[PDB]
Amino acid sequence: ADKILDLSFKKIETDLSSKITYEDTGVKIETDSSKSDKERYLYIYQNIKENWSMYNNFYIEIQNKNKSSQKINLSIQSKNMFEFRLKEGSEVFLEGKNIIYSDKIKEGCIEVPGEFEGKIYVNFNSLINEESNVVLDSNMLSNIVSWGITFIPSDEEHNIVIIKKISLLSE
Amino acid sequence: DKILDLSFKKIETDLSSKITYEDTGVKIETDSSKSDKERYLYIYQNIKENWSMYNNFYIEIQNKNKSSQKINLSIQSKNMFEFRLKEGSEVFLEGKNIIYSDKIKEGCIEVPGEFEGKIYVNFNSLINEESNVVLDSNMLSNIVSWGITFIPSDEEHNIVIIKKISLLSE
Ligand SMILES: [Cl-]
Ligand SMILES: [Cl-]
Ligand SMILES: [Cl-]
Ligand SMILES: [Cl-]
Ligand SMILES: [Cl-]
Ligand SMILES: [Cl-]
Ligand SMILES: [Cl-]
Ligand SMILES: [Cl-]
Ligand SMILES: [Cl-]
Secondary structure, three states, X not given: OOEEOOOOOOOEXXXXXXXXXXXXXXXEEEEEOOOOOOOOOEEEEEEEEEOOOOOOEEEEEEEEOOOOOEEEXXXXXXXXXXXXXXXXXXXXXXXXXXXXXXXXXXXXXXXXXXXXXXXXXXXXXXXXXXXXOEEOOOOHHHHEEEEXXXXXXXXXXXXXXXXXXXXXXXX | OEXXXXXXXXXXXXXXXXXXXXXXXXXXXXXXXXXXXXXXXEEEEEEEEOOOOOOEEEEEEEEOOOOOEEEEEEEEEOOOOEEEEOOOOEEEEEOOOOEEEEEOEOOEEEEOOOOEEEEEEEHHHEEEOOOOEEOOOOHHHXXXXXXXXXXXXXXXXXXXXXXXXXXXXX
């Protein structure tokens, strides 16, 4: 039950000029920039409201028409707050015309080699929320740093409570 | 099941206390004044663990007084989010003579007099007030935005073709 994501190019934050063309399938993205500009980028995003708990990864069918390697990265947002980016060092899988290999996320990016024409596998455990360190397929329980009990004694001058045991149950 | 280590640090507000660690649990003795309405004893332990595999908080406690006590929970995640009892949530207090489902009143749990049983609290009854995020809620549950950034090579004219972007179930 693969879920195909709608590719809309109405929302773009960039510092380049480009020509986007829809074809039978997918879309061609042409950019004109310079070697000097080391801040160059073309961020393309969408606004949604979907539940993705039944999926475990991104499958990006991309093709590079240049001999030089490209670079791409992902960013997901949950609860209009938590932003998830590629976890540095995490393994991603690139399947080309004849070879499939593992490459680690470097400087927050995925290297797309020259003439690459294939698909890219990025598991959701590869996207993380920096601040919380919570990976996209987990929850806040994944990184508990403190637990405590607040006690508000009765109007009696001296109160005593006995705590025999505290544990965490799981179905 | 994971038996939490009963080792604490404490904050005292308008009261003094003693924490003795006996073989039959930890005894908490407080000395305070009926007039000091800001009385409050916070006992906690800082750690670095993963409780994803768990779903509930088991607390067996005994109240030595005839007057009710009030307890609250505070679980913190590295991002400095503190989760507390959700207002209107349900908690189960199983005593010897009385057993029932209880409600969170003013963010606290009423511990009846001479109570001597167990209190069950599900992690979905813990929430961060400002974010309004439940402690066991998965991130994938509510996705509001997703994006892809393209960083071109040094070549002046770059062309990348994206035929398809999907989510695979596993
Ligand atoms: Cl979409
Ligand atoms: Cl949507
Ligand atoms: Cl290839
Ligand atoms: Cl290359
Ligand atoms: Cl002791
Ligand atoms: Cl501690
Ligand atoms: Cl009881
Ligand atoms: Cl509260
Ligand atoms: Cl809060």
